[PDB]
Design a protein around this ligand. Structure first.
Ligand SMILES: [Cl-]
Ligand SMILES: [Mg+2]
Ligand SMILES: [Mg+2]
Ligand SMILES: [Mg+2]
Ligand SMILES: [Mg+2]
Ligand code: NA
Lengths: 242, 242
């Protein structure tokens, strides 16, 4: 029946950490004539606007910044919930109180500010502070390998809040994320289940276990494809829909 | 003896939350043919570029962003200072940890994010965090007025770190500031007291207590004038210098 194409953005539609090429932009739009298309990323709407254009809500049938906790369908904003409503204020606090009590114990070269960034669907936690300078960031990054700060930190939290239904992911140089079980990229599948699609195709460049696309790739709701590079994604879309 | 005029930027030479007008700017450049000019405000340099224009460091003899922590003189940088450099990594770590542990002990209805905001000349501390919504600030302030939460926090901080050159001033609805003693507008005087000016005129709009210009206005090294708007600063300058 009717189908929908779901695309991860970074590394899938674009070269990593760069805007999309217009060659691909035109290909996607030529493909939109055949079926509906959608995009999903962990970055905020502004970053997705940067990587794929300002008009992005107007050129894609769905746009799912922040893994889908901000969700646009056909130009209009959907239905949204945040981390406070879902977990409840007491667990939030109990988790915030723990992270602060833990960071106060870490011994570091330098510490700065914004130790917990409250996002829409996660708590970013940085032992050094997100306010860090670019130099202090690389310096903390390198010490974290040597003495396993973030790793040991995530281990204590997994144990202390086991069963409270949270996932802990480490990314980048300074931080790790804390988010509710299932609020990775398969969160946006909430918005495409009831819209009557026979097949929902997904494309992502990190379908390996431990990658940002794995859980949405292995989800039964998606016929998932594993893409190596943007050109591969066009290679695969050329074969299915034409 | 030669004289120097120092203005606060917001309210004195500009309309509040507005860029300087072309008339004010031009007026000042003609005052600069009679006397030496200097501007001081608590905003960082880039905002100060938004208020007075991007060429600001040629236009005045002295440009003192962030109350003088940044200091340009005669077009060039004369000095830079932050509180990490001044108190040193060790004790500002001790001051961060104490604040992190103390916040974990606070039983609040809602905790959010950005409890410790790092700024170049002050730490901004908020038990509930600055990311919270206005509606939640009010909820915390109605709690705070009853249960004296910032009052008690500041107390213990004052018993912990005040033989170390720190001042604590509660302010606003949710937070309070932690800064080295005398890092108000009074700070920039160390840069001009050595250039041999007999009288140092100061023009500010908030010279009464609880004001950002109060202490520089009360300072014996400054011949201070309280100003109600830019039309008034001009009127006073005329009566003083021509
Ligand atoms: Cl924080
Ligand atoms: Mg990707
Ligand atoms: Mg699947
Ligand atoms: Mg002012
Ligand atoms: Mg004075
Ligand atoms: Na952003």
């Amino acid at each position: 029946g009717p189908a929908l194409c779901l695309f991860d953005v970074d590394g899938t539609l674009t070269a990593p950490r760069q805007k999309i090429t217009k060659e691909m932009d035109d290909f996607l739009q030529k493909l939109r004539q055949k079926i509906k298309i959608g995009v999903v990323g962990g970055s905020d709407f502004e970053k997705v606007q940067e990587q794929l254009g300002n008009d992005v809500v107007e050129k894609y049938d769905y746009v799912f910044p922040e893994n889908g906790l901000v969700a646009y369908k056909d130009g209009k904003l959907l239905c949204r919930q945040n981390i406070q409503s879902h977990l409840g204020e007491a667990l939030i606090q109990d988790l915030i109180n723990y992270c602060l009590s833990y960071i106060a114990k870490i011994k570091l070269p330098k510490k700065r500010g914004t130790f917990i960034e409250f996002r829409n669907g996660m708590l970013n936690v940085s032992p050094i502070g997100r306010s860090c300078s670019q130099e202090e960031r690389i310096e903390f990054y390198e010490l974290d390998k040597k003495e396993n700060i973030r790793q040991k930190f995530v281990a204590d939290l997994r144990k202390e809040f086991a069963g409270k239904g949270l996932t802990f992911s480490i990314g980048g140089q300074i931080s790790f994320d804390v988010f509710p079980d299932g609020w990775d990229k398969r969160y946006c599948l909430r918005h495409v289940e009831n819209d009557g699609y026979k097949t929902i195709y997904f494309f992502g460049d990190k379908t390996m276990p431990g990658g940002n696309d794995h859980e949405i790739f292995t989800d039964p709701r998606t016929m998932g494809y594993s893409v190596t590079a943007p050109e591969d994604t066009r290679r695969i879309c050329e074969l299915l829909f034409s």
